[PDB]
Amino acid sequence: YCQKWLWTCDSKRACCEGLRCKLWCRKEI
């Protein structure tokens, strides 16, 4: 689900739940 976390969901894998695939995935609220 996640993308290595702190990595740009794409060349590795999609983004996790809540994360922001915009530019780079990362925890947020």
JSON list of N, CA and C in Angstrom, two decimals:
[
{"chain": "A", "resi": 1, "resn": "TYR", "atom": "N", "xyz": [0.83, -1.20, 0.00]},
{"chain": "A", "resi": 1, "resn": "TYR", "atom": "CA", "xyz": [0.00, 0.00, 0.00]},
{"chain": "A", "resi": 1, "resn": "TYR", "atom": "C", "xyz": [0.87, 1.26, 0.00]},
{"chain": "A", "resi": 2, "resn": "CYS", "atom": "N", "xyz": [1.73, 1.37, 1.01]},
{"chain": "A", "resi": 2, "resn": "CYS", "atom": "CA", "xyz": [2.62, 2.52, 1.12]},
{"chain": "A", "resi": 2, "resn": "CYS", "atom": "C", "xyz": [3.64, 2.54, -0.01]},
{"chain": "A", "resi": 3, "resn": "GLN", "atom": "N", "xyz": [4.54, 3.51, 0.04]},
{"chain": "A", "resi": 3, "resn": "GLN", "atom": "CA", "xyz": [5.58, 3.64, -0.98]},
{"chain": "A", "resi": 3, "resn": "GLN", "atom": "C", "xyz": [6.94, 3.88, -0.35]},
{"chain": "A", "resi": 4, "resn": "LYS", "atom": "N", "xyz": [7.35, 2.97, 0.52]},
{"chain": "A", "resi": 4, "resn": "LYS", "atom": "CA", "xyz": [8.64, 3.07, 1.20]},
{"chain": "A", "resi": 4, "resn": "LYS", "atom": "C", "xyz": [8.59, 4.14, 2.29]},
{"chain": "A", "resi": 5, "resn": "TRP", "atom": "N", "xyz": [7.55, 4.96, 2.26]},
{"chain": "A", "resi": 5, "resn": "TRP", "atom": "CA", "xyz": [7.39, 6.02, 3.25]},
{"chain": "A", "resi": 5, "resn": "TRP", "atom": "C", "xyz": [8.46, 7.09, 3.08]},
{"chain": "A", "resi": 6, "resn": "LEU", "atom": "N", "xyz": [8.02, 8.36, 2.96]},
{"chain": "A", "resi": 6, "resn": "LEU", "atom": "CA", "xyz": [8.91, 9.50, 2.62]},
{"chain": "A", "resi": 6, "resn": "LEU", "atom": "C", "xyz": [9.41, 9.42, 1.13]},
{"chain": "A", "resi": 7, "resn": "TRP", "atom": "N", "xyz": [8.93, 8.44, 0.38]},
{"chain": "A", "resi": 7, "resn": "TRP", "atom": "CA", "xyz": [9.32, 8.29, -1.02]},
{"chain": "A", "resi": 7, "resn": "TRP", "atom": "C", "xyz": [8.16, 8.63, -1.95]},
{"chain": "A", "resi": 8, "resn": "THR", "atom": "N", "xyz": [8.48, 9.00, -3.18]},
{"chain": "A", "resi": 8, "resn": "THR", "atom": "CA", "xyz": [7.47, 9.36, -4.16]},
{"chain": "A", "resi": 8, "resn": "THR", "atom": "C", "xyz": [6.82, 8.11, -4.75]},
{"chain": "A", "resi": 9, "resn": "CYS", "atom": "N", "xyz": [5.64, 7.76, -4.24]},
{"chain": "A", "resi": 9, "resn": "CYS", "atom": "CA", "xyz": [4.81, 6.66, -4.71]},
{"chain": "A", "resi": 9, "resn": "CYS", "atom": "C", "xyz": [4.79, 6.53, -6.21]},
{"chain": "A", "resi": 10, "resn": "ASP", "atom": "N", "xyz": [5.53, 5.58, -6.81]},
{"chain": "A", "resi": 10, "resn": "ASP", "atom": "CA", "xyz": [5.54, 5.45, -8.26]},
{"chain": "A", "resi": 10, "resn": "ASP", "atom": "C", "xyz": [6.57, 4.41, -8.70]},
{"chain": "A", "resi": 11, "resn": "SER", "atom": "N", "xyz": [7.84, 4.79, -8.67]},
{"chain": "A", "resi": 11, "resn": "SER", "atom": "CA", "xyz": [8.92, 3.89, -9.08]},
{"chain": "A", "resi": 11, "resn": "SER", "atom": "C", "xyz": [9.09, 2.76, -8.06]},
{"chain": "A", "resi": 12, "resn": "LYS", "atom": "N", "xyz": [8.38, 2.86, -6.95]},
{"chain": "A", "resi": 12, "resn": "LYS", "atom": "CA", "xyz": [8.45, 1.85, -5.90]},
{"chain": "A", "resi": 12, "resn": "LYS", "atom": "C", "xyz": [7.09, 1.19, -5.69]},
{"chain": "A", "resi": 13, "resn": "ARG", "atom": "N", "xyz": [6.08, 2.01, -5.42]},
{"chain": "A", "resi": 13, "resn": "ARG", "atom": "CA", "xyz": [4.73, 1.50, -5.20]},
{"chain": "A", "resi": 13, "resn": "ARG", "atom": "C", "xyz": [3.77, 2.64, -4.87]},
{"chain": "A", "resi": 14, "resn": "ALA", "atom": "N", "xyz": [2.47, 2.33, -4.87]},
{"chain": "A", "resi": 14, "resn": "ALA", "atom": "CA", "xyz": [1.45, 3.33, -4.57]},
{"chain": "A", "resi": 14, "resn": "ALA", "atom": "C", "xyz": [1.61, 3.87, -3.15]},
{"chain": "A", "resi": 15, "resn": "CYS", "atom": "N", "xyz": [0.75, 4.83, -2.81]},
{"chain": "A", "resi": 15, "resn": "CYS", "atom": "CA", "xyz": [0.70, 5.39, -1.48]},
{"chain": "A", "resi": 15, "resn": "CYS", "atom": "C", "xyz": [-0.23, 4.77, -0.50]},
{"chain": "A", "resi": 16, "resn": "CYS", "atom": "N", "xyz": [0.16, 4.96, 0.77]},
{"chain": "A", "resi": 16, "resn": "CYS", "atom": "CA", "xyz": [-0.66, 4.32, 1.80]},
{"chain": "A", "resi": 16, "resn": "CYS", "atom": "C", "xyz": [-1.93, 5.13, 2.05]},
{"chain": "A", "resi": 17, "resn": "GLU", "atom": "N", "xyz": [-2.76, 4.69, 3.01]},
{"chain": "A", "resi": 17, "resn": "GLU", "atom": "CA", "xyz": [-3.98, 5.41, 3.41]},
{"chain": "A", "resi": 17, "resn": "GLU", "atom": "C", "xyz": [-3.61, 6.70, 4.15]},
{"chain": "A", "resi": 18, "resn": "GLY", "atom": "N", "xyz": [-4.13, 7.85, 3.68]},
{"chain": "A", "resi": 18, "resn": "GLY", "atom": "CA", "xyz": [-3.91, 9.14, 4.31]},
{"chain": "A", "resi": 18, "resn": "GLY", "atom": "C", "xyz": [-2.75, 9.89, 3.70]},
{"chain": "A", "resi": 19, "resn": "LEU", "atom": "N", "xyz": [-1.69, 9.17, 3.36]},
{"chain": "A", "resi": 19, "resn": "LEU", "atom": "CA", "xyz": [-0.51, 9.78, 2.77]},
{"chain": "A", "resi": 19, "resn": "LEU", "atom": "C", "xyz": [-0.89, 10.67, 1.59]},
{"chain": "A", "resi": 20, "resn": "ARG", "atom": "N", "xyz": [0.06, 11.48, 1.14]},
{"chain": "A", "resi": 20, "resn": "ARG", "atom": "CA", "xyz": [-0.17, 12.39, 0.02]},
{"chain": "A", "resi": 20, "resn": "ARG", "atom": "C", "xyz": [0.78, 12.08, -1.14]},
{"chain": "A", "resi": 21, "resn": "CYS", "atom": "N", "xyz": [0.24, 11.39, -2.13]},
{"chain": "A", "resi": 21, "resn": "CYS", "atom": "CA", "xyz": [0.98, 10.98, -3.32]},
{"chain": "A", "resi": 21, "resn": "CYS", "atom": "C", "xyz": [1.40, 12.18, -4.18]},
{"chain": "A", "resi": 22, "resn": "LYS", "atom": "N", "xyz": [0.91, 13.37, -3.82]},
{"chain": "A", "resi": 22, "resn": "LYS", "atom": "CA", "xyz": [1.28, 14.63, -4.44]},
{"chain": "A", "resi": 22, "resn": "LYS", "atom": "C", "xyz": [2.76, 14.94, -4.19]},
{"chain": "A", "resi": 23, "resn": "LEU", "atom": "N", "xyz": [3.57, 14.84, -5.23]},
{"chain": "A", "resi": 23, "resn": "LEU", "atom": "CA", "xyz": [4.99, 15.11, -5.13]},
{"chain": "A", "resi": 23, "resn": "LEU", "atom": "C", "xyz": [5.71, 13.98, -4.40]},
{"chain": "A", "resi": 24, "resn": "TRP", "atom": "N", "xyz": [5.33, 13.75, -3.15]},
{"chain": "A", "resi": 24, "resn": "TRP", "atom": "CA", "xyz": [5.93, 12.70, -2.34]},
{"chain": "A", "resi": 24, "resn": "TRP", "atom": "C", "xyz": [4.99, 12.26, -1.23]},
{"chain": "A", "resi": 25, "resn": "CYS", "atom": "N", "xyz": [5.00, 10.97, -0.93]},
{"chain": "A", "resi": 25, "resn": "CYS", "atom": "CA", "xyz": [4.14, 10.49, 0.12]},
{"chain": "A", "resi": 25, "resn": "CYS", "atom": "C", "xyz": [4.70, 10.61, 1.48]},
{"chain": "A", "resi": 26, "resn": "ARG", "atom": "N", "xyz": [3.81, 11.05, 2.37]},
{"chain": "A", "resi": 26, "resn": "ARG", "atom": "CA", "xyz": [4.25, 11.31, 3.73]},
{"chain": "A", "resi": 26, "resn": "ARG", "atom": "C", "xyz": [3.06, 11.48, 4.67]},
{"chain": "A", "resi": 27, "resn": "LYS", "atom": "N", "xyz": [3.26, 11.14, 5.94]},
{"chain": "A", "resi": 27, "resn": "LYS", "atom": "CA", "xyz": [2.20, 11.25, 6.93]},
{"chain": "A", "resi": 27, "resn": "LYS", "atom": "C", "xyz": [1.69, 12.69, 7.03]},
{"chain": "A", "resi": 28, "resn": "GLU", "atom": "N", "xyz": [0.38, 12.84, 7.22]},
{"chain": "A", "resi": 28, "resn": "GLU", "atom": "CA", "xyz": [-0.22, 14.16, 7.34]},
{"chain": "A", "resi": 28, "resn": "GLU", "atom": "C", "xyz": [-1.66, 14.05, 7.84]},
{"chain": "A", "resi": 29, "resn": "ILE", "atom": "N", "xyz": [-2.23, 15.19, 8.23]},
{"chain": "A", "resi": 29, "resn": "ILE", "atom": "CA", "xyz": [-3.60, 15.22, 8.73]},
{"chain": "A", "resi": 29, "resn": "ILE", "atom": "C", "xyz": [-4.24, 16.59, 8.48]}
]
